[PDB]
Amino acid sequence: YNDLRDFLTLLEQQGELKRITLPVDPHLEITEIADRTLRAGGPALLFENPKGYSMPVLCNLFGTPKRVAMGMGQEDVSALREVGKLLAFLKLNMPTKRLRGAPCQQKIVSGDDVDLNRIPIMTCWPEDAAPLITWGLTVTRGPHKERQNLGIYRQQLIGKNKLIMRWLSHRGGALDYQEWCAAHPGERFPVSVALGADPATILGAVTPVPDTLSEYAFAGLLRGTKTEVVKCISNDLEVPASAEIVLEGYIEQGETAPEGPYGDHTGYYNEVDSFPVFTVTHITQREDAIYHSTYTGRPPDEPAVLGVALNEVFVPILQKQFPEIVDFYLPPEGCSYRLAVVTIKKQYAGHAKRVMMGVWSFLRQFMYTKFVIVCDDDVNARDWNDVIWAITTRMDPARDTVLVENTPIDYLDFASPVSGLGSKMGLDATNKWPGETQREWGRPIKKDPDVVAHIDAIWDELAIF
Amino acid sequence: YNDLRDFLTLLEQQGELKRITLPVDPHLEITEIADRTLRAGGPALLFENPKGYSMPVLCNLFGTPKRVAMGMGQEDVSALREVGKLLAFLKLNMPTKRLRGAPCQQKIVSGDDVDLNRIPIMTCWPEDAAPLITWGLTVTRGPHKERQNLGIYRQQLIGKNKLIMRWLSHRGGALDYQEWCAAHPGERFPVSVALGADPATILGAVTPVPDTLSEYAFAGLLRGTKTEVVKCISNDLEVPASAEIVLEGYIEQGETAPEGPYGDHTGYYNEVDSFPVFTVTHITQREDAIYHSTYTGRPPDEPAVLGVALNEVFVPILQKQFPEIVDFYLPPEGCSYRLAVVTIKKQYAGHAKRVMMGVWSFLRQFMYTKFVIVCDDDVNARDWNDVIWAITTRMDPARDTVLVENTPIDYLDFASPVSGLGSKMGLDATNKWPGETQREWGRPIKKDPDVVAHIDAIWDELAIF
Numbered sequence: 001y002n003d004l005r006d007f008l009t010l011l012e013q014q015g016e017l018k019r020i021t022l023p024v025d026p027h028l029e030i031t032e033i034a035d036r037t038l039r040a041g042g043p044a045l046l047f048e049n050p051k052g053y054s055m056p057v058l059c060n061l062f063g064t065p066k067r068v069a070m071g072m073g074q075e076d077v078s079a080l081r082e083v084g085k086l087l088a089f090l091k092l093n094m095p096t097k098r099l100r101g102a103p104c105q106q107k108i109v110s111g112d113d114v115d116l117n118r119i120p121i122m123t124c125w126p127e128d129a130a131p132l133i134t135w136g137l138t139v140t141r142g143p144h145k146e147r148q149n150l151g152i153y154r155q156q157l158i159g160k161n162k163l164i165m166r167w168l169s170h171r172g173g174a175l176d177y178q179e180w181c182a183a184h185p186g187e188r189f190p191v192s193v194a195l196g197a198d199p200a201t202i203l204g205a206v207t208p209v210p211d212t213l214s215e216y217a218f219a220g221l222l223r224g225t226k227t228e229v230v231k232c233i234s235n236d237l238e239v240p241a242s243a244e245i246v247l248e249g250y251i252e253q254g255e256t257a258p259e260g261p262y263g264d265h266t267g268y269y270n271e272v273d274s275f276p277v278f279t280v281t282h283i284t285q286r287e288d289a290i291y292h293s294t295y296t297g298r299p300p301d302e303p304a305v306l307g308v309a310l311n312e313v314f315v316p317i318l319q320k321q322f323p324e325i326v327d328f329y330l331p332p333e334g335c336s337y338r339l340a341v342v343t344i345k346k347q348y349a350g351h352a353k354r355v356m357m358g359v360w361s362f363l364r365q366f367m368y369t370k371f372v373i374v375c376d377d378d379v380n381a382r383d384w385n386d387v388i389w390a391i392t393t394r395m396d397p398a399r400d401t402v403l404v405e406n407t408p409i410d411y412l413d414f415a416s417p418v419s420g421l422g423s424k425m426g427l428d429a430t431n432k433w434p435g436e437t438q439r440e441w442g443r444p445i446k447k448d449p450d451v452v453a454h455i456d457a458i459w460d461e462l463a464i465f
Numbered sequence: 466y467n468d469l470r471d472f473l474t475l476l477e478q479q480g481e482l483k484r485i486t487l488p489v490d491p492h493l494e495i496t497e498i499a500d501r502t503l504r505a506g507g508p509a510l511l512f513e514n515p516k517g518y519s520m521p522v523l524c525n526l527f528g529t530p531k532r533v534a535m536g537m538g539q540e541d542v543s544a545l546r547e548v549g550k551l552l553a554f555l556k557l558n559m560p561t562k563r564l565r566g567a568p569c570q571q572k573i574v575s576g577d578d579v580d581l582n583r584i585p586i587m588t589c590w591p592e593d594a595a596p597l598i599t600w601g602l603t604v605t606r607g608p609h610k611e612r613q614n615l616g617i618y619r620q621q622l623i624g625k626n627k628l629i630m631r632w633l634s635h636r637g638g639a640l641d642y643q644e645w646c647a648a649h650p651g652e653r654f655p656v657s658v659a660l661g662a663d664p665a666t667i668l669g670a671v672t673p674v675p676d677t678l679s680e681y682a683f684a685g686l687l688r689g690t691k692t693e694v695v696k697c698i699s700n701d702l703e704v705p706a707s708a709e710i711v712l713e714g715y716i717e718q719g720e721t722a723p724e725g726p727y728g729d730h731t732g733y734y735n736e737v738d739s740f741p742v743f744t745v746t747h748i749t750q751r752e753d754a755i756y757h758s759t760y761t762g763r764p765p766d767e768p769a770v771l772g773v774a775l776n777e778v779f780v781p782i783l784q785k786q787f788p789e790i791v792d793f794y795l796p797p798e799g800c801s802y803r804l805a806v807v808t809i810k811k812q813y814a815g816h817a818k819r820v821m822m823g824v825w826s827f828l829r830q831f832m833y834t835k836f837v838i839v840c841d842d843d844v845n846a847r848d849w850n851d852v853i854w855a856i857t858t859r860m861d862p863a864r865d866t867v868l869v870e871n872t873p874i875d876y877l878d879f880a881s882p883v884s885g886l887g888s889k890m891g892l893d894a895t896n897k898w899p900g901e902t903q904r905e906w907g908r909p910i911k912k913d914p915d916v917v918a919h920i921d922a923i924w925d926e927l928a929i930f
């Protein structure tokens with residue numbers, strides 16, 4: 001049973017983890033280093049000497065697709081499709097295995113001794129409001145079901161023992177709190193946050209499994225074995241046994257604070273807004289604890305790399321429903337969800353429009369996708385050279401562009417004319433069939449597969465690079 | 466194990482079947498009688514004295530929703546939802562049970578003795594080209610899988626032993642033939658047609674189960690027990706053992722004939738077009754055989770009543786995917802598939818547009834739906850009084866109407882500007898939320914549920930009708 005430390009050791013053995021011994025400030029400096037590293041496809045980073053703290057800081061953990069795959073016990077990135085086929089069936093789901101004691105409760109501090117300032121929480125960007133916890137697995141139960149939800153919600157530092165809990169309103173945690181409030185007026189909402197759990201639990205948390213299902217159960221499937229957990233000290237929630245740090249506490253009903261501004265995955269600052277305050281009553285950690293952090297900003301960043309790997313998970317679920325779809329890609333440059341390229345084997349006139357509507361309606365994660373480009377299967381959706389080629393040789397813009405007004409949009413997307421409402425554009429860049437055009441359509445250049453394969457065979461020997 | 470005769474007996478016991486002893490021509494007259502009957506919600510009809518023939522003619526079998534439900538061993542129409550929940554799982558599927566001999570092979574004629582003119586095939590409308598077989602279960606195998614498909618394809622009489630097989634190109638039968646042609650050039654394609662099988666097999670044939678699955682397997686689930694079949698005399702296809710008449714034969718490759726014109730379910734004549742010729746080498750029947758027929762025309766007709774009952778089957782499959790959908794209805798007046806009314810519990814601004822796109826993309830049977838009206842849950846989708854009310858009080862036409870051009874359309878729909886391509890219109894007739902309007906939206910009149918229930922209780926006693 002591999003905890004996070006075992007994963008770091010595996011990475012180090014493979015030249016995928018660098019230990020930095022120079023002094024580096026968690027205030028801005030770590031982010032700059034991680035950003036350059038991620039942008040060059042470099043390793044994960046363990047800062048052994050954060051200025052002013054004793055606890056090392058781990059970041060860029062999932063900065064490459066490879067390391068995301070490795071984190072689910074797979075060799076490489078195309079095994080994620082198989083995990084998609086699995087995620088299909090969940091639309092006896094294995095419980096947690098509760099241990100009696102756990103490394104994450106080796107050192108405990110509570111009440112007045114709680115001081116989040118001892119932790120090397122990072123400040124990512126110059127106009128961010130305060131240090132920000134970015135890799136916390138927040139654990140919650142609602143009043144109506146037993147399911148334990150895990151989500152990653154950014155958490156601003158506002159005191160020795162107070163964090164702001166920034167869950168957006170459709171999240172498991174947020175819905176649990178909302179229901180708790182209705183069902184138990186004025187009663188404190190217990191919550192716990194785990195930092196540095198095992199990679200399967202972390203990845204399970206971020207995968208959009210249905211609200212009905214504990215993210216712990218999914219992590220179990222990725223791992224091959226039940227998720228090892230421990231009961232929290234001050235509530236009935238369970239956290240991963242191997243976690244490096246655990247924060248336990250509650251939300252006082254009605255207590256809120258102005259959150260931000262903070263730089264986002266879109267590359268802009270979010271403006272101030274109100275979210276609940278999480279009061280921390282306990283902090284439990286391992287001996288020699290490691291603090292796991294990250295940053296979001298202009299893409300690409302670690303979340304976006306995560307999000308490309310998790311798109312591979314969705315391809316099979318889309319293909320079950322639309323078997324005409326050969327590939328489906330959300331470029332990290334499009335802020336991970338705002339633009340999709342879809343390639344199909346077109347079977348009839350107007351086919352592309354059915355596929356656009358399918359992307360905009362079938363799965364909720366794509367409901368806010370503003371641009372959808374549809375192409376034939378002779379295009380590689382992951383290469384702008386092919387996609388722009390297809391756009392500029394197979395479209396008449398007015399004929400082949402679909403615009404739909406007054407559709408749901410992310411309320412933080414400031415480019416829509418009104419908060420929560422905007423338009424969508426689909427580009428039909430498929431070959432046009434009789435009926436769709438009265439011209440003689442061009443015959444595209446296809447490569448000889450025998451020549452392709454032969455050159456694959458001698459590629460390394462040719463040694464051009 | 467209930468064959469068709471057992472079903473007719475059940476209907477007769479319940480005042481749901483009328484035997485007509487007067488002489489009635491299968492040329493036009495039966496259709497006129499059945500049409501008036503169906504339009505008044507009357508019984509199924511057994512014409513014991515068809516002018517010029519000895520074999521009784523059964524029609525309007527499924528002319529009411531009740532009789533469709535009865536035909537699946539259920540009390541009434543809301544049990545069809547449960548069959549939808551079942552049809553979901555199919556996206557060990559029980560085989561057929563093959564008997565050694567069967568009532569449908571009591572009387573056999575083959576080769577030169579085959580004479581389809583002895584059968585009281587109906588001519589439905591005055592400008593129809595020739596008598597037309599309308600309730601044949603066509604049975605086919607393809608070369609690549611073992612699955613036996615069942616479909617209802619209209620069949621024009623063109624000789625003592627020749628019928629035209631009018632399968633449209635996306636049908637199981639048509640795809641099987643097409644593949645047979647590629648895989649075995651010039652070899653005859655064996656085919657068999659069963660008339661008057663048991664209701665579960667008939668309904669199973671018409672239900673859109675995936676191409677991968679034999680319609681026999683589905684009939685088995687509806688029935689509770691494996692479908693009883695018999696091997697055909699001149700091929701390896703199996704037909705239902707209780708069938709009244711079976712036609713066996715083949716399609717000669719390249720043999721085609723001009724089909725039609727024939728009146729359609731749209732209320733217009735289809736123009737002439739070419740389809741394959743089915744050469745009949747055998748006709749097998751029961752002693753005292755009954756000929757099962759129907760007609761299509763301006764709706765409503767029997768197919769359309771079938772199609773409303775089978776929509777109840779889809780509601781659950783839509784609700785699995787879009788749990789916001791409260792009801793989903795395709796009016797028979799809209800030619801059964803061209804217009805949908807959908808009611809939702811709206812949860813955010815722009816929600817209606819996601820639902821429209823879902824109807825146009827999720828299931829293939831709704832891919833050609835040209836109009837989609839979306840409303841809130843205080844509307845009964847089945848009552849034009851509520852739907853028009855919603856349209857005229859909750860829409861600004863230019864703001865709330867979505868038009869999409871160049872989408873797939875039925876090639877027989879002559880109203881689209883080009884064959885196979887046309888536009889779609891969605892009407893967002895939901896209550897508009899802040900963001901979608903800056904006005905003060907009206908507060909609708911809701912009834913008191915206690916008053917409703919009280920009046921339900923005394924309704925019969927009040928005796929107004």
Ligand SMILES: Cc1cc2c3c(c1C)C(C)(C)C[C@@H](S(=O)(=O)O)N3c1c([nH]c(=O)[nH]c1=O)N2C[C@H](O)[C@H](O)[C@H](O)COP(=O)(O)O
Binds near residue numbers: 294
């Ligand atoms: C991996 C990750 C994810 C997330 C986030 C972050 C990371 C690293 C951080 C904290 C760095 C950045 C923000 S941000 O991308 O919104 O700017 N963050 C985040 C947020 N979801 C959310 O509601 N608030 C958040 O604050 N998301 C997404 C969220 O955690 C994810 O959608 C979960 O699957 C939601 O789980 P459920 O609530 O559906 O169970």
Ligand SMILES: Cc1cc2c3c(c1C)C(C)(C)C[C@@H](S(=O)(=O)O)N3c1c([nH]c(=O)[nH]c1=O)N2C[C@H](O)[C@H](O)[C@H](O)COP(=O)(O)O
Binds near residue numbers: 614617618619635673
């Ligand atoms: C119940 C019924 C159905 C059908 C039909 C008829 C009836 C009575 C008749 C013969 C009266 C009328 C025509 S019509 O509605 O197209 O005008 N008919 C029919 C036709 N499907 C088809 O390809 N050709 C047809 O000729 N359909 C629909 C088809 O049989 C149905 O879609 C099956 O589910 C197709 O099965 P698969 O090929 O998908 O396995």
Ligand SMILES: [Mn+2]
Binds near residue numbers: 150209211213215
């Ligand atoms: Mn969840």
Ligand SMILES: [Mn+2]
Binds near residue numbers: 637676
């Ligand atoms: Mn079929």
Ligand code: NA
Binds near residue numbers: 149172206208209215
């Ligand atoms: Na989650």
Ligand code: NA
Binds near residue numbers: 614616637671
């Ligand atoms: Na069928």
